[PDB]
């Protein structure tokens, strides 16, 4: 709006939980990954109900108790589900910052010919200048 780098940024009763536990996309129930409990609770005793926030990338369900979160954030950068690659993994040191994705005339390229001691420092598009190389799962298992 004013020149920002836009990458991922945009007290009532139990009624929060039905508005979050039902997405009305397929008429099903979303179950968290750490625990296989939706924990919608009962209307008479709503204290056992747990708020669930979904991911903004892969729509992975997550309880507010499994991941150390205490509130829903809807202004600013969208919440990231912690089941993805780290953005600034630190190992003098190294600050990995990815190589992004290229949509300009398919410049990113796909050349799978080695997949051995590839040493491609990550950045793989897994299948069953800048070069996002192609990798397979057999090579990942082998190495």
């Amino acid at each position: 709006s004013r020149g920002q780098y836009s990458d991922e940024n945009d007290t009532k009763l139990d009624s929060y939980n039905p508005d979050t536990h039902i997405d009305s996309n397929s008429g099903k129930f979303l179950i968290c990954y750490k625990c296989n409990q939706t924990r919608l609770g009962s209307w008479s005793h709503p204290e056992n109900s747990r708020l669930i926030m979904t991911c903004d990338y892969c729509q992975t369900p997550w309880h507010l108790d499994c991941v150390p979160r205490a509130s829903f954030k809807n202004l600013g950068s969208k919440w990231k589900c912690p089941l993805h690659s780290p953005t600034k993994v630190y190992k003098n040191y190294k600050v990995w910052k990815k190589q992004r994705l290229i949509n300009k005339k398919n410049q990113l390229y796909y050349e799978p010919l080695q997949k051995i001691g590839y040493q491609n420092n990550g950045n793989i598009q897994i299948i069953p200048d800048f070069k996002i190389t192609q990798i397979d799962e057999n090579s990942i298992k082998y190495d």
Partner: peptide, 19 residues
């Protein structure tokens, strides 16, 4: 348990394996 494994990097594996 590794038993076998067989741009300009498309041919260095063959010479390394043979020699």
């Amino acid at each position: 348990g590794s038993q076998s494994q067989l741009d300009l990097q498309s041919c260095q594996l063959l010479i390394k394996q043979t020699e």
